[PDB]
Design a protein around this ligand. Structure first.
Ligand SMILES: [Cu+2]
Ligand SMILES: [Cu+2]
Ligand SMILES: [Cu+2]
Length: 251
């Protein structure tokens, strides 16, 4: 499409991550206000999720049960809130330094980019101990996404590239993006198309499934994109750091 919609969030200061659930509810981490806001589909009014003690959130993910998972930079931890709950759970990750992105697969496994430790960690549902994914030579990961097959996609700031690992594989794959500068967020649709916020080039890049054609999505007026999400219809949602807004573009 050639229509971008500014969603009616208010008062954002460095919106850092975005997620969209199956109902079309949009969740945004508002880094500079220590909060996560949500907007139900068609609603005019955001609500603030009742995380307690949250500081400087980066990433957000939502599972099919509606549980919301958030990374907290200032406390170096990951928290989750079940739908309808007022009492978060701190997940049993350990030793995080700048947890930057979070994703949750269909089995409830939680994947977190640990930016300051140059690694991606994962925690199975019910486990108390993370494992480190075998992403050789990873540096400063920002964003993570997991697809319905369990393939994990990660952006690497220091190396300006995007890598993936299939479930059960030891061989990572470097995706055929070109010309990235500070890839931040990543999202993947069920067709396999991969969307990346190319923060240092002020643009959002699409790698079309199959053809591997890279295009720039026709967002307008961005002042450095951070987070990205894509819904089942192919609508792409982006957080715009310098303009303190969240915008969407239909396919
Ligand atoms: Cu931070
Ligand atoms: Cu970085
Ligand atoms: Cu920025």
């Amino acid at each position: 499409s050639n229509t971008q919609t500014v969603l009616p969030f208010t008062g954002l200061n460095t919106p850092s991550g975005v997620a969209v659930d199956s109902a079309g509810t949009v969740y945004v981490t508002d880094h500079g206000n220590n909060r996560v806001v949500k907007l139900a589909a068609g609603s005019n009014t955001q609500t603030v999720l009742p995380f307690t003690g949250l500081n400087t959130p980066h990433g957000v993910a939502v599972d099919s049960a509606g549980t919301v998972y958030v990374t907290d930079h200032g406390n170096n931890r990951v928290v989750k809130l079940a739908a309808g709950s007022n009492t978060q759970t701190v997940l049993p990750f350990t030793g995080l330094n700048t947890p930057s992105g979070v994703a949750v697969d269909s089995a409830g496994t939680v994947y977190v980019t640990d930016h300051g430790n140059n690694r991606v960690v994962k925690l199975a549902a019910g486990s108390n101990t993370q494992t480190v994914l075998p992403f050789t030579g990873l540096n400063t990961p920002h964003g993570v996404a997991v697809d319905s097959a369990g393939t994990v996609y990660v952006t690497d700031h220091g190396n300006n590239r995007v890598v993936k690992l299939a479930a059960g594989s030891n061989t990572q794959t470097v995706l055929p993006f070109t010309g990235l500068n500070t890839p931040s967020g990543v999202a993947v649709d069920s067709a396999g198309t991969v969307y990346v916020t190319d923060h240092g080039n002020n643009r959002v890049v699409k790698l079309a499934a199959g053809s591997n054609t890279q295009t720039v999505l026709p967002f307008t007026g961005l002042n450095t994109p951070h987070g990205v999400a894509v819904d089942s219809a192919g609508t792409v949602y982006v957080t715009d750091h310098g303009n303190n807004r969240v915008v969407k573009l239909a396919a």
